[PDB]
């Protein structure tokens, strides 16, 4: 066929029940993730092609960057709880990978402050059980699929995108193949 299991995607031989429809994992320490977000704009092009009645989910992971990796998973929970993902994603990626000015939880906090989140509001969220449970969700979703690498995308808890099987000569063509593959898997 044109889309073949083991080529543009793989099937999980243990499917995950009740999973989010489109579920993407990343790390602010992850070099391809930086490309995916700032250069390729994957999440965004996928969304533009998804049918509707299908919502998109993105989670941070712990297994890169040790202690700071964990802080970032908690900060991303704060971002989700406050609905400020689209204001902190770029400065967090650049702070970790470009300027390398993020070295502590306080440095992560500064990014939110600079993005206009008030200090008390950030700290309140950081310490809240709603954020604790949101951290728990991120961990559980990753555990459910035995996640050992990012970037990663899963459709309906049964299919895993396989970008290694796509031409990268042209960055735009790669992105559409990626997005079109997600749509195909979505309609399966």
Tell me the three-class secondary structure of 32-52, residue by residue. Answer: HHHHHHHHCCHHHHHHHHCCC
> Of 110, 107, 32, whose CA–CA distance to 67 is shortest?
107
Cβ–Cβ under 8 Å, residues 166 and 173:
no
This structure was determined by: X-ray
Instruction: Give residue for tokens 């008030």.
Output: 118
Cβ–Cβ under 8 Å, residues 72 and 60:
yes
Token couple for 183:
């749509």
The torsion angles phi and psi of 29, rounded to 5 degrees, stand at -90, -5
Token couple for 63:
């297994």
Residue 125 has a CB neighbour count (10 Å cut-off) of 22
Residue 159 has a CB neighbour count (10 Å cut-off) of 22
Long-range contacts of the stretch 92-98 (C-beta < 8 A, 24+): 92/28, 93/28, 93/33, 93/34, 93/37, 93/38, 96/28, 96/29, 96/65, 96/72, 97/28, 97/29, 97/31, 97/34
Q: How long a stretch of residues is the chain?
A: 188
> Of 17, 4, 37, whose CA–CA distance to 184 is shortest?
4
Q: Where does residue 82 rank: exposed (0-12), middle (13-18), buried (19+ CB within 10 A)?
A: middle
The structural domains of the chain, ordered by start, are: 1-188 (3.40.30.10)
Resolution (A): 1.8
Instruction: Give residue for tokens 């969700």.
Output: 137
Q: How far apart are CA 28 and CA 58, in angstroms?
A: 12
Cβ–Cβ under 8 Å, residues 30 and 149:
no
Instruction: Give residue for tokens 């049964």.
Output: 158
DSSP the chain: --S-BTTTEEE-SS--TT--SEEEEE-TT-HHHHIIIIIS-HHHHHHHHS-SS--EEEEE-SSSSHHHHHHHHHHHHHHHHHT-HHHHHHHHHIIIIIS----SHHHHHHHHHHTT--HHHHHHHHH-HHHHHHHHHHHHHHHHTT--SSSEEEETTTEEE-GGGS--SSHHHHHHHHHHHHHHHHT-
* Angle between helix 85-93 and 105-114 (nearest 10): 130
Q: Where does residue 102 rank: exposed (0-12), middle (13-18), buried (19+ CB within 10 A)?
A: buried
């Amino acid at each position: 066929a044109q889309y073949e299991d083991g080529k543009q995607y793989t099937t999980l031989e243990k499917p995950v029940a009740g999973a989010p429809q489109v579920l993407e994992f990343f790390s602010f320490f992850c070099p391809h993730c930086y490309q995916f977000e700032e250069v390729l704009h994957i999440s965004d092009n996928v969304k533009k092609k998804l049918p509707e009645g299908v919502k998109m989910t993105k989670y941070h992971v712990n297994f890169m960057g040790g202690d700071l990796g964990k802080d970032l998973t908690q900060a991303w929970a704060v971002a989700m709880a406050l609905g400020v993902e689209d204001k902190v994603t770029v400065p967090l990626f650049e702070g970790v990978q470009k300027t390398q000015t993020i070295r502590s939880a306080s440095d992560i906090r500064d990014v939110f402050i600079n993005a206009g989140i008030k200090g008390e509001e950030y700290d309140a969220a950081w310490n809240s059980f709603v954020v604790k449970s949101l951290v728990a969700q991120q961990e559980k979703a990753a555990a459910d699929v035995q996640l050992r690498g990012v970037p990663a995308m899963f459709v309906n808890g049964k299919y895993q995108l396989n970008p290694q099987g796509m031409d990268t000569s042209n960055m735009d063509v790669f992105v559409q193949q990626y997005a079109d593959t997600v749509k195909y898997l979505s309609e399966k």
